[model samples]
Target: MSKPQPIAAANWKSGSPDSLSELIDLFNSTSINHDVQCVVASTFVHLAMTKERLSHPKFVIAALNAGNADALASLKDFGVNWIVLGHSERRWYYGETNEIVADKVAAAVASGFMVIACIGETLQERESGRTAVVVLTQIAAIAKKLKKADWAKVVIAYEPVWAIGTGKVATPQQAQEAHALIRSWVSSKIGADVAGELRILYGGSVNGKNARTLYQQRDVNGFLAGLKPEFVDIIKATQ
Candidate 1:
């Protein structure tokens, strides 16, 4: 069996039934790389529905947020094997602290859920050159709580705040700088072997035109693609 690494994950936020139907159609038509296992994260209530529409080795359904143990446990029956946490939207709205994010990550990993733990810098922080500090601090908290071996279930996504919906996307160079920084941090803090195997994804405004460029970066293992029409092309880039 091919290892199901969380690369080329699609974080399609809440959508209507009709929209989800279209999403399934898109997946049906696309051919993903065998080395990559795509994560399709959608609204929490519709995972089983998503699985019903599509369930195969090429893809798996994920929860955007697993609220509590009650909700997390319930996802098992619904065919949701992955969880996403520390999204900027969740942070801006709820003021999610690092400790809070770490707790949920550890708990989710404990329950055997593959977790996408997000870490990023704000626009202001980026402007002030605090991107490294902000993102590293965020990831460090999660690393501290997780045992070295637990990293197998985690994928780190770097979403630059300035790149999101601002008509400005992160260039391949910028994305690599951040990914390399994160990877170096992991190498020193955690074991180098763990860092070598860690999959770090570039988030924010990842479209087909730039997917391959960004993926070319040495440390950019994959992508956390958001809503877009060229998603299929982005997946194809992984090939």
Candidate 2:
């Protein structure tokens, strides 16, 4: 791959179709750059409406929930094949264990679809400087199941757990370090070739003010943010 394009994915949480309409309007109002591989992960309920309202050449939708690993579902017929697995909330809130999360990753990849496989530590675990230990273990479960060809369809997105409610966002420098950790893991877990080829995303609590610096991280492929106006600014910062 020729330097994977910078990806700016807006992760929208649960919302009604009307909620999606406003978001689509804002996206339409923002500048679109083919250079940025833009994606939006919308709730399952509004996926179709999102598909209809969003028609940018480079922008697409991803399903936040694809029915988990037990029996992974697809919105492919609706032109939606990308799914977010091992999502932060899914891990703790809804009983999605690492084994379960990885199962979804394996299923999604094997089923011939792309996945934004997320990894992170819990707040309590993060406080003890065990981010890498916990997250690596998180991926280790998935690593064992990944086939050689599965690498291409997998995107490792890191969302720092400690970044939440501490009165500060994860620093650009820390984001770089964490991303380097994921890349290094890929180097050792998979191989050097994949380590270099993989795209590692930063799920930072960010906005236009901080995105420019965050994008400069050597291993930082792109970021995921949610605020409407902030998301637009984030896309601009990618350039």
Candidate 3:
């Protein structure tokens, strides 16, 4: 509709109850207000504990092994709107497959929850230069089942397996290359009109320090922040 806004992540590894409250406070205090969409991500168990605090904020539950239709159903009454499926950790550590990820997306959408479906290559894959092939294949699988109108609700995050939590973020050129290729793939697979409107987010070792430069990419719509999301100057990183 308007210019794409920053989608800040409220990621915490521990003390999630307090962290969720702190994040809600940050959302209220920030001047970015409508310019940013804050998605607070936490473990499914923590979601149950901090349900009240997260009621107003957009909650992004990491749908690893623990998340299912029941989990999504449980949070429907708590104002949870988004769910992150097929993240690197889920695929690598939890042994989730592309087929399973697609199933998860369908189930989440069926339950009235939006999804940020992730797809990316590892350092080894990138070293062999198969990034585009890997990402496009992932997108194509999901695109096959989705209608053009459904693109608005499906945000794709290109998270390189090597870059996440490694403090070694993708160079601007590297990210641009992947993002541009993704946009082109979307436009070709879907339609130019719908692809141009899709919001493609970048996720991998993102912090306040690199956010501005990363956000400035023509194809980069927003971010799926990792590690500590309590960056004091994160809002300042928006262009």
Candidate 4:
């Protein structure tokens, strides 16, 4: 079978619509490698306008956080097919429980939207050596609600809270281990063939410098950059 397309998703959290125009223009103008699939996750305020202005065929738009059936429908109405659910900031700042995220994931997938479901352990959870437990628990909640076929609409983004925006990145081994574990868990829940096709991305302080190394990991399919210009370098790194 052909390899899955590697993704480079940018999360523009609360960035103004005007500010994103230039970045989208830059991304559209740049010639991305054929092997990579690029997406920009815009703030809710900017989604419609940004989607309207973006011109690249390979590039698409995603929402940073969509947590409910109503919001998911609104996203679809705006012509957005992709949504980022359960980001760390939403979990920490907004007190989003795993149960809630699972509901969101179910709603998005049922609504025919592709979901990038974010799951990870917090710094405290990681320090306590509950990384696998925490991540698995988060995934299990969603797994119970999704059918085996629904896995096709989902992408898992592993973003350890401690490394996110802290300028600290997980070692390549650290990332690989987590990704491998996640894939294994999915394999057990679904089946080897389906798990093998699942794309699990790494997020958290991923930039130009470390992207290539992280991408080298067998299970690390792509990245979710937190809305930075370095995303351009990340795209190049994959090349």
Which numbered prediction scores highest in TM-score against the true structure? 4
Please give, for residues 175-226, the per-residue lDDT of candidate 1 as tens digits: 9999989999999999888888888888888888989888777788888777
What is the Cα-based TM-score of model 1? Answer: 0.93
The top-ranked prediction according to lDDT is 4
* lDDT, candidates in the order shown: 0.80, 0.77, 0.70, 0.84
Q: Model 3: per-residue lDDT, tens digit, 92-119?
A: 6676677778777777777777788878
Model 2, residue 34: what's the lDDT?
47
Task: Estimate, for each residue in 130-184, the C-alpha lDDT of model 2 and write its tens digit.
Answer: 8889888887888888977689888888876555434456788788888888788
The global Cα lDDT (0 to 1) of model 3 is: 0.70
CA RMSD per model (angstroms):
2.4, 2.3, 2.8, 1.6
Candidate 2, clashing residue pairs?
none
TM-score of each: 0.93, 0.90, 0.86, 0.94
Error of 2 at 108 (Å): 0.6
lDDT of 4 by residue, 131-187 (tens): 999888988998988999999999999998888889999999999999999999999
Task: Judge candidate 2 against the unseen true structure and give its global Cα lDDT, from 0 to 1.
Answer: 0.77
Model with the higher lDDT, candidate 2 or 4: 4
